[PDB]
Design a protein around this ligand. Structure first.
Ligand SMILES: C[C@@H](CN)Nc1cccc2cc(C(=N)N)sc12
Ligand SMILES: C[C@@H](CN)Nc1cccc2cc(C(=N)N)sc12
Ligand SMILES: [Ca+2]
Ligand SMILES: [Ca+2]
Ligand SMILES: [Mg+2]
Ligand SMILES: [Mg+2]
Ligand SMILES: [Mg+2]
Ligand SMILES: [Mg+2]
Ligand SMILES: [Mg+2]
Ligand SMILES: [Mg+2]
Lengths: 225, 7, 225, 7
């Protein structure tokens, strides 16, 4: 596509407007249309794509958890049917994002900053599928994408915010999805410690970006230990 | 738990 | 309709679930389908219909105001085109609600509690249309519906929360839409004063419901005087 | 200004 007749620059401009208006479904559709133009995305454009779909799937995850909790308590067909409706819509959003990464964002991403960003996303959207799955193959798909993205360790410094956000999300995968709380804690601790030892190399602006994600690693470790 | 980016 | 195959009781149950999940577009579609069964609505069901569409149109109004403000500042076609897109979606939601009230909620509403509730809604959804209109006929439609609903004064006590919420919204119509700030202030003052003199007749529970809306009249009067 | 019901 419905965005096939709109200029790429117009879709990006409208994604930024939709973000200002908190219209995240519109923002996601504008960024899908921008991706389908077939050109690689800039750093800013990758971030618009991620923020749009994170917000959309975030609403669906929050709704699914409410309906799942009611359904569990209730144990008529209505609660199950409506939880299934929301689950199917969530799966469709995850499949759309995985479709964009596979056709053809990942294969055309050669720089570490782009390839790690897209592989982290692929891990995240398999993780969201795993949260509602009843499932082993989905978990291994998440793991595989996260692992390729981590193997960041070769190309990025330990304070790189993309590398930090990847390790954050991979640690939560381990804790919540893979039932590996010790792996989760080890990854979060090592990631935090290696970042802390590299902070001395950063400007005031990079330091702010790195320490914000380090605080998320610390918040998890506080809950986990 | 905390994951990267918005809610 | 898409809800034509679902039981009325199932649509109402799913509207309550959608509300718990903050899925207001789903809640509105479930209540539209319940209305289209052709049976009159209970007090609880009227409130589900109103909350669903208030939440949906509330998101659209907030987005439209953001885009309108950017558009005014900018004075390419993108800002205007995207504001027009959101405006058209808002108009469509208002037209859907006005369609339900006209086919056939209002004509089948004989009790004061139902007929005033639906006529207040008709005033509100014309008001939302008037907010984006560039317009005299839309304003007079809002005014007409509000006036018929006010003429509440015959059938309801001055503390009736429906009567209070009507006067609240009609006063805002006067202030913001009709450019009649003196009418707005007079209506809010008289409504507040007459309610205060009837509070002595209420239970603790009715007193709470009445004073909550009286505080909204007071908050406006504080901003206006 | 305040109108009736949710935001
Ligand atoms: C560190 C990075 C996450 N990988 N954040 C960003 C970097 C560059 C641009 C940009 C634009 C954004 C928006 N419009 N919400 S978020 C963001
Ligand atoms: C005073 C009245 C407004 N005219 N409020 C209500 C009265 C009766 C039931 C009911 C159910 C609601 C919901 N599920 N959000 S709101 C509401
Ligand atoms: Ca359903
Ligand atoms: Ca548009
Ligand atoms: Mg072009
Ligand atoms: Mg399912
Ligand atoms: Mg141990
Ligand atoms: Mg039936
Ligand atoms: Mg227009
Ligand atoms: Mg005066």
């Amino acid at each position: 596509g419905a965005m096939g007749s709109m200029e790429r620059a117009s879709l990006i401009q409208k994604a930024k407007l939709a973000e200002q208006a908190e219209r995240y479904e519109d923002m996601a559709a504008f960024m899908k249309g921008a991706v389908e133009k077939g050109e690689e995305l800039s750093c800013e454009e990758r971030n618009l794509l991620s923020v749009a779909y994170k917000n959309v799937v975030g609403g669906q995850r929050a709704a699914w958890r409410v309906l799942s909790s009611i359904e569990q308590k209730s144990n008529g067909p209505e609660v199950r049917e409506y939880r299934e409706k929301v689950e199917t819509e969530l799966q469709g959003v995850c499949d759309t994002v995985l479709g964009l990464l596979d056709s053809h964002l990942i294969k055309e991403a050669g720089d570490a900053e782009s390839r790690v960003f897209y592989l982290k996303m692929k891990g995240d959207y398999y993780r969201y599928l795993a949260e509602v799955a009843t499932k082993k193959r989905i978990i291994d798909s998440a793991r595989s994408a996260y692992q390729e993205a981590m193997d960041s360790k070769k190309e990025m410094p330990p304070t790189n915010p993309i590398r930090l956000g990847l390790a954050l999300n991979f640690s939560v995968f381990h804790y919540e999805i893979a039932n590996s709380p010790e792996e989760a804690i080890s990854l979060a601790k090592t990631t935090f410690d290696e970042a802390m030892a590299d902070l001395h190399t950063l400007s005031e602006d990079s330091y702010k970006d790195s320490t914000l994600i380090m605080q998320l690693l610390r918040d998890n470790l506080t809950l986990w230990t | 738990f905390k994951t990267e980016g918005p809610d």
